[PDB]
Design a protein around this ligand. Structure first.
Ligand SMILES: [Zn+2]
Ligand SMILES: [Zn+2]
Ligand SMILES: [Zn+2]
Ligand SMILES: [Zn+2]
Lengths: 409, 409
């Protein structure tokens, strides 16, 4: 049994035509008109494949294929259609549309299952327009209330909840109200491991835990000409030395830990004035609870000490956190076995990023499947997979789901 | 014997009322309409003091007080009325309005001079809106042609030359056509030295030379979750290590050198994506030619080696440069002597920043006078001096000018 990879591929290219970016990728941020366009197209496809559409109060979309057991809970296949402003075509979209290809493959064969199958598009997974990321799955898994989620505002000062109403995807359903037999998410690695190790299938075992530590450094705004070295209070240098320490800390915890900085903000950011304020986020991740606690403790001690070294003030706010996630070992094994059975090359991998699956794992037996991506490139328009990679993992998805939903024939 | 410090102070407070900033300072950037308003008020004052106004093709304003010798070249008293967006009330303004106070004090006493005195408001000294700084004095001293200066455009894409015409300060006079007997500029220190050493008067002997080395680092945009440490090409860490090098190089060149970074720009600047591009300016300065060449050479060699260490691409563009300026020893001497005779405390100081004086020094015997400023604060709305500080240095200015222009009696 396999999926129609050509049909999968075509769907990916059709969805990529909505909210196209500036370089062959996508800018289809959550709750834009472009996102509404993608939602509608997906719904059209879902209906054409015999699925009934449910929508929750966060706008998550649940497309149900009936099971033959009316008491059986559904096997959910989820991801997200929303993208980064420099979005790739495959991040998120692959998982959603793989779920759709699974259905279509089951419809082609008239397969009946005991469990219903529900293909799921989570609202605002990316957290690019409204933070946090994984916002709708967050409410679903009880991580935060609807109120909190609704009040998230974008860089235009519009709220999530207003925008959700504006495009008319404020659904009827209570968020978190569905119980899942199981949850699968198929996604690109967003990293270079599978490609570099030549593996078609990443058997996701865990998701790495993280802290986002937002560091605000307070310097003295001082002309870089007229201020002698000995009288500088240099928040940019402090930031710099902290970035070194972050690298040193990450390296002391190898293997299987990361830390680094993506976002750095100097104020005023003039060429001839030392910053009054420097803000940055230390992103530290590991599947190892001990390493995550250890890096976080180290940062809490050393970051202000490095600031203090330069007379720079320092406050640290935890703006993101979850502990390492263990995917359901039975579902993991199904994915591993299916990859073996299908003759695909495969390895076990840690999910480096968070996904909606990391939240569903709290309320439901959850796992993920990875396919490779070229050069580990993600969150960028040049993000690439082959149709062969797309289909390989969708095949593993088909098998793992069908084993879980249970074929009636 | 002295200036009216009350009248000086009042003029400062009147000028600070035009294009007021957010917080006690000024946003009266060059060739804004509020710049035009400041120009107009200064002209009104100038005319009421018996000065005739000339304007060059850059909009520099030259207010002449007659001399008794019709062949004598003028003693120029210059600064600028344009401010940083978060400008202080005193930067530039003090010099121009001190020139006006000198005139008024000479008029109060009906003093005649051999040399005419010209009060000068240079256009776009700050270089906030249209870069570089010292644009009008630059053209005056032949550093750059009118073409280049006119073609400077702001962040809105309006050109300097359009804007100059818009406000109707495109003057008749050929830029650089005036020959100066002498040039004085009275300016705040913009640094903490005079304040820290309890001196009222900075006798400026030299202006430090500079290089501005804009470094563009090319990294790999890579998710900070999904990318293993060993596969990162981290342009932000490269930037960090370069900032540390910059500090270590600065500290090796003490005494009498600076280097540091005010401007840092990460792209895309997301929390979960390592930058594809980091741009920053290494601002390095010293009155020592040897140390300036040394620092420059060391950066040109070591910055790419730091980048190469991390696999980061590196490109260095010199975006600004002038050599150390020696102010005219005779005019320096007069400033020092006038401070001594008047009983003000005083020290020799190096101009940390560039000023219009540093360009006039090419075509004319030039010097500067500094007064203190609170905490070295400049290019910020909380930039502060006392009326006492303002007046002490304007007194030294009156004496130095009158000795140079020569009293008739
Ligand atoms: Zn995703
Ligand atoms: Zn993503
Ligand atoms: Zn100035
Ligand atoms: Zn200034």
């Amino acid at each position: 049994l396999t999926v129609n990879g050509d049909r999968l591929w075509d769907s990916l290219m059709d969805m990529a035509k909505i909210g196209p970016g500036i370089a062959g990728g996508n800018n289809r941020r959550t709750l834009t008109d472009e996102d509404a366009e993608g939602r509608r197209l997906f719904q059209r496809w879902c209906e054409a494949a015999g699925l009934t559409m449910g929508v929750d109060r966060m706008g998550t979309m649940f497309a149900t294929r009936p099971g033959e057991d009316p008491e059986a809970l559904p096997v959910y296949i989820g991801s997200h259609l929303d993208t980064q402003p420099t979005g790739g075509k495959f991040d998120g979209v692959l998982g959603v549309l793989a779920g759709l290809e699974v259905v279509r493959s089951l419809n082609d064969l008239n397969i009946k299952t005991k469990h219903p199958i529900v293909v799921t598009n989570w609202s605002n997974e990316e957290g690019a327009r409204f933070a946090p990321a994984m916002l709708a799955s967050g409410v679903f898994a009880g991580i935060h209330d609807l109120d909190y989620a609704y009040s998230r505002t974008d860089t235009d000062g519009k709220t999530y909840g207003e925008e959700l109403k504006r495009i008319g995807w404020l659904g009827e359903e209570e968020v978190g109200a569905r119980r899942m037999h199981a949850y699968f998410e198929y996604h690109i690695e967003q990293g270079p491991i599978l490609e570099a190790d030549g593996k078609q299938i990443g058997v996701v075992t865990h998701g790495q835990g993280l802290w986002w530590l937002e560091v605000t450094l307070t310097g003295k705004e001082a002309h870089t000409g007229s201020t002698p070295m000995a009288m500088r209070v240099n928040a940019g240098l402090a930031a710099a030395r902290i970035l070194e320490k972050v690298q040193e800390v990450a390296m002391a915890h190898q293997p299987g830990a990361v830390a680094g900085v993506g976002q750095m903000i100097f104020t005023p950011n003039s060429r001839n004035v030392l910053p009054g304020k420097v803000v940055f986020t230390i992103d530290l991740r590991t599947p190892s609870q001990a390493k995550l606690d250890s890096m976080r403790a180290i940062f809490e001690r050393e970051v202000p000490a490095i600031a203090e070294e330069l007379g720079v003030g320092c406050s640290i706010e935890a703006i993101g956190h979850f502990d390492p996630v263990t995917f359901d070992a039975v579902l993991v094994g199904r994915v591993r076995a299916a990859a073996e059975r299908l003759g695909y090359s495969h390895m076990d991998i840690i999910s480096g990023a968070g996904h909606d699956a990391c939240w569903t794992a709290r309320v439901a037996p959850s796992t993920m499947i990875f396919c490779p991506c070229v050069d580990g490139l993600s969150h960028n328009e040049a993000e690439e997979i082959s149709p062969e990679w797309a289909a390989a993992g969708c095949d593993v998805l088909l098998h793992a789901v069908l084993e879980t939903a249970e074929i009636v024939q």
